[PDB]
Write a protein that binds this ligand. Structure first.
Ligand SMILES: Cc1ncc(C[n+]2csc(CCOP(=O)(O)OP(=O)(O)O)c2C)c(N)n1
Ligand SMILES: Cc1ncc(C[n+]2csc(CCOP(=O)(O)OP(=O)(O)O)c2C)c(N)n1
Ligand SMILES: [Mg+2]
Ligand SMILES: [Mg+2]
Ligand code: NA
Ligand code: NA
Ligand code: NA
Lengths: 555, 556
């Protein structure tokens, strides 16, 4: 009889099911309609439980977790606007490959389209953004537990990447408990004390080994390093070296950047020339950062364009004739090995070295370009780097040479300035590692309430808020000068000292290299967050990037 | 010739079509793909432009501005997750009626599903929630200007309520010297440019016809329920119900003056529900009923007819009575359906109502949130407005307080999200330019904390009361499980707002008693600025006080 009882039983099946697909972290916001789920989640010791109050921030907390752990991560929110707040993180996951399990509680059908409080149309909400969507029915004994678990299983197990939306209607009552659904739960036999799914469906998606690799490696080819794992970046740096091919590695590639300041040199006739001679470009990973690289890539004309990543669909915004190959990068390289061939490029290496030389000559100024340049003086040892959006990711790319195999993380799929503080958190938590995060002032304002989560870290995390008073990328872009402060830049004339106090975070506003150094030396001493604020002249960053762009276009 | 110049006239037409549907305010966030729309929005002087860095907050600003002005309000965002951050406000629009028109910039088709940065599938992302959606094609001269403005005029002319999604693809280049490429293209509309009118006028009226059996129905023993409506409508509903001598069950969102206050306590006494059992008809004006006992009574009553009269569409009766659903401007309907003077039929309820109120008054003294809820009418700004937050505050004020007639009350009680409250309030004050009282709980203030930025520009004093019971104490009102309540429900954040207030240069007070609270109330009404007032309370005293009071009154 007890509708309470059953409800908690139906939710219990749901949350154990995900025990079977590697779900370790579950992130939770409060709600009422959510109780069946949250309880079930709370009572299951297979999980590490996180909570936050801002469902959008929650979503990015899961995102961060998933991004580092490479595990599916489950989220529970209540019905209503709460669910919609998950959209951003979902969109990004749908683009970058994070597996997010979204369990969104709902009113029963009796209560849809009839003026009931907090009652929205929720199935289909995220349209084509989730990889799989599940519209669960009105919980009843008449549908066996085996159906419920078989559906969840198919969803999770055939999940190459992106998230999964599972909608979970619950009618009232929701608080009560009885035996009511016990015999129904036990129809699942010893599955309850098992390790595995009820239904095992986990076929692999992989592109066959390319039979003409041996032909193609003998030609003048270029390697492009996209977003990939720390370790894939090492394996790739080595692979290109051996092949003799010039490596143009993005900031997110953790390849070592053997030809640094690419955003610069790629802007020089002598470089484009040499590169014109290539016949095959093999790009590994995607979401390329630099402006000049995207243009080079747009207009480059090799006989064939290869792109290799374990994410599905097209990744060439330019639509070259060629191939799109789905694989684990490290797995793909083993399968397409390199043979010792001799470097064919001779003028690019000069140009790279000269372009870095141009940059260090400009290093003394206490600005954001200078910070980005000098960033690997600051990387916490055995740690990880979370890079913001806007100017920051573009600066470090253009100006800094990151070590091979140092892990970098970032939200570069859709590039939102909306989840960054909270993504950084879930990144810090997933790996246990000291973390450095850099973000601009509008991005830290966006997600300012994530300063709450940053009270619970498992190793030091330093948040650098580069404060140039507004969205200054819109001073790098040729935005109509007259409208640009009010409708582009939006300076908020703010600081972050009180924001840090509120969440009892340690704060520094260093005013030169000496004091920012002391800041760090205090930061890494304790398993807490410290807000560091660099206040800089609004356009110094972008101007300087521009001048170096011209400098390097000229030699 | 120049692509970037055609893009500008393509946008300029779009923003000029808005101009002829009453669109006055337009809320804008930064962006680059949005640039043509933002240029055309800012070049076009028919608008008042509002800007904000947070697109969910921007969304909620637009919502507020619309909530007050009753005009459609425009938003401009760039492509990506910026678009997705408008969902909250859109869905709330979907329920309470605000016309928000969302101009969402986009990459052109080529750059979709190809690994392009900041490029997501934008058409349809909001599903059924917007009222209509336009999926505008790739800008070209081969599509007559007269097409773009007809399609918008249809969109806006036929919008009875809720949101509009206009997706705007634009292809690089987006910057250049403004040639005069699409000019003769623009000139194809002709003097329309100098008119004030829609190109196509399509604005057919949706309304329910006159209830020809009203003279019969108005003579029976009815009940009048008053939900969300306009302040003016409140007054009107209060007269009309006292005329028919029916008992008025007014919601806090009803603005009737609640002649039977504390309905949430007296509806729990077995004597009231017994009397009401006599009702042959219930005429409910407006929707989103507030308290639990009125919801429980609504679901349980069994008149021969139930009527919901409101100017939004669809069913509004979550209990699905036999009866009628009646779409119209409430006042208009009062005029079409006049009251006849008849004898009050209710003997018991009016006695309990004054007995409920007395019982609350007995407890007015303690410095907690139940008390604040009760006293509030003593603190309303002269000729100003009330923005009432979600969770406890709405329910306590509903339960424990009696607000005056026709005092404007605003809130987000459609989906009841605590995700956009401050940012909504700002928009709510900007729309009318009235002194404003927004009350909001601690998690609700963390959720929109960056909206503090927006509450640095107010035309008129606005007080922000933050009630800090260290958590979501509505989860102490509900029978949640004692074991996991604290970390999985209440989520106490252990925080204050002194510094948040300092951060945005907003005056702060943490009053400890009634003397201090009213002091802070006074100096606050003397400047067109926000003064934040944080009331720190013992977490469960609010919940309990209500609980107890529900119990005392169920025994009277
Ligand atoms: C959700 C969302 N809103 C808006 C944008 C557009 N956008 C890109 S960069 C940027 C500027 C961010 O400013 P700041 O945080 O200071 O970084 P800075 O530009 O100074 O480098 C904006 C608003 C976006 N990418 N995502
Ligand atoms: C966007 C959104 N997320 C979650 C909820 C569910 N919810 C309702 S009340 C509440 C707690 C609000 O806490 P607080 O702001 O401190 O007010 P109080 O409960 O103390 O009245 C939550 C999380 C909601 N209605 N909307
Ligand atoms: Mg900035
Ligand atoms: Mg609270
Ligand atoms: Na896993
Ligand atoms: Na299998
Ligand atoms: Na004070």
């Amino acid at each position: 009889m007890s509708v309470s009882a059953f409800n908690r039983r139906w939710a219990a099946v749901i949350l154990e099911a995900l025990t079977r697909h590697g779900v370790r972290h579950i992130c939770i916001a409060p709600g009422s309609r959510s109780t069946l789920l949250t309880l079930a989640a709370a009572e299951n010791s297979a999980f590490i439980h996180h909570t936050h109050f801002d469902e959008r921030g929650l979503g990015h907390l899961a995102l961060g977790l998933a991004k580092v752990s490479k595990q599916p991560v489950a989220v529970i929110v209540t019905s209503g606007t709460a669910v919609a707040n998950l959209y951003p993180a979902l969109i990004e996951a749908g683009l970058t490959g994070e597996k997010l399990i979204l369990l969104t509680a709902d009113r029963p059908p009796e209560l849809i389209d009839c003026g009931a409080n907090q009652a929205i149309r929720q199935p289909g909400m995220f349209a084509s953004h989730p990889t799989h969507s599940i519209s669960l029915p009105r919980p009843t004994q008449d549908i066996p537990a085996r159906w419920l678990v078989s559906t969840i299983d198919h969803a999770l197990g055939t999940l190459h990447a992106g998230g999964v939306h599972i909608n979970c209607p619950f009618a009232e009552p929701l608080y009560g408990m009885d035996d009511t659904g016990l015999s129904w739960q036990q129809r699942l036999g010893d599955w309850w004390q098992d390790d595995k799914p009820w239904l095992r469906e986990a076929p692999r998606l992989e592109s066959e080994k390319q039979r003409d690799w041996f032909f193609w490696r003998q030609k003048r080819g270029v390697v492009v390093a996209g977003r990939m794992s720390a370790e894939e970046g090492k394996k790739v740096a080595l692979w290109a070296q051996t092949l003799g091919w010039p490596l143009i590695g993005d900031v997110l590639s953790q390849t070592g950047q053997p030809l640094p300041c690419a955003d610069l040199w790629l802007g020089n006739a002598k470089a484009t020339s040499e590169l014109q001679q290539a016949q095959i470009v093999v790009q590994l990973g995607s979401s390329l950062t630099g402006k000049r690289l995207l243009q080079w890539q747009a207009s480059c004309e090799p006989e064939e364009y290869w792109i290799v990543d374990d994410i599905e669909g097209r990744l060439d915004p330019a639509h070259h004739r060629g191939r799109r190959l789905i694989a684990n990068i490290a797995d793909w390289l083993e399968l397409h090995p390199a043979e010792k061939r001799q470097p064919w490029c001779v003028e690019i290496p000069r140009l790279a070295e000269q372009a870095m030389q141009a940059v260090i000559a400009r290093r003394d100024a206490f600005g954001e370009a200078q910070l980005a340049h000098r960033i690997c003086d600051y990387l916490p040892e055995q740690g990880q780097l979370f890079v913001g959006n806007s100017l920051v990711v573009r600066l470090i790319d253009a100006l800094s040479q990151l070590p091979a195999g140092y892990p970098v993380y970032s939200n570069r799929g859709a590039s939102g300035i909306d989840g960054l503080l909270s993504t950084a958190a879930g990144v810090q938590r997933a790996s246990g590692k000291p973390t450095l995060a850099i973000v601009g002032d509008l991005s830290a304002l966006y997600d300012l309430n994530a300063l709450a989560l940053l009270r619970q870290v498992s190793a030091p995390l330093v948040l650098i808020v580069v404060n140039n008073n507004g969205g200054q990328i819109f001073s790098l872009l040729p935005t109509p000068q007259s409208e640009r402060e009010r409708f582009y830049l939006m300076p908020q004339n703010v600081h972050f000292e009180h924001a840090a106090a509120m969440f009892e975070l340690k704060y520094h506003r260093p005013q030169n290299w000496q004091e920012l150094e002391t800041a760090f030396a205090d930061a890494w001493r304790t398993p807490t967050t410290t807000v560091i604020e660099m206040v800089v002249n609004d356009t110094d960053g972008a101007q300087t990037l521009q001048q170096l762009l011209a400098q390097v276009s000229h030699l």
